[PDB]
Amino acid sequence: TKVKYPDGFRSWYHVKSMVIQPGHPLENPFGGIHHVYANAEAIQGLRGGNYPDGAVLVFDLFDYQEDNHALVEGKRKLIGVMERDAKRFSATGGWGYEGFGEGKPDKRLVTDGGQGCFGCHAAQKESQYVFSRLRD
**Which residue positions form the known binding site for Zn(2+)?**
27, 66, 69
Give me the residues paired with residue 58 across strands: 37, 81
d(CA 82, CA 41): 12
Q: Is 112 in the site for a second copy (CB under 8 A)?
A: no
Out of 7, 8, 25, 125, the residue judged to bind a second copy by CB under 8 A: 25
Of 26-85, which residues contact a second copy (CB under 8 A)?
26-27, 33, 35, 37, 64, 68-73, 76
Stretch that binds a second copy, among 9-17, 82-90, 91-99, 108-116 (CB under 8 A): 9-17
Of the candidates 88, 83, 91, the residue with the CA atom closest to the CA atom of residue 5? 83
Instruction: Give residues with Cβ within 8 angstroms of 72, minimum separation 6.
Output: 64, 65, 66
Return the number of the residue (23 or 25) whose C-beta is nearest Zn ion: 23
Would you give the DSSP letter of residue 5?
A: P
DSSP run (H or E) holding 77: strand 70-84
DSSP assignment string, 107-119:
-B---STTHHHHH
Q: Given the complex with a second copy, which of 71 and 109 has the nearer CB atom?
A: 71
Indicate which of ligand HEC, a second copy, Zn ion, none lies near residue 93 (CB less than 5 to 8 Å, by partner kind): none
> Is 96:86 a contact under the CB 8 Å cutoff?
no
- The total number of residues shown for the chain amounts to 136
Which residue, judged by CB position, is nearest to ligand HEC in the bound state? 117
> Among residues 72 and 91, whose Cβ is nearest to a second copy?
72
Contacting positions for a second copy (CB under 8 A): 10-11, 13-14, 16-27, 33, 35, 37, 64, 68-73, 76, 103, 135-136
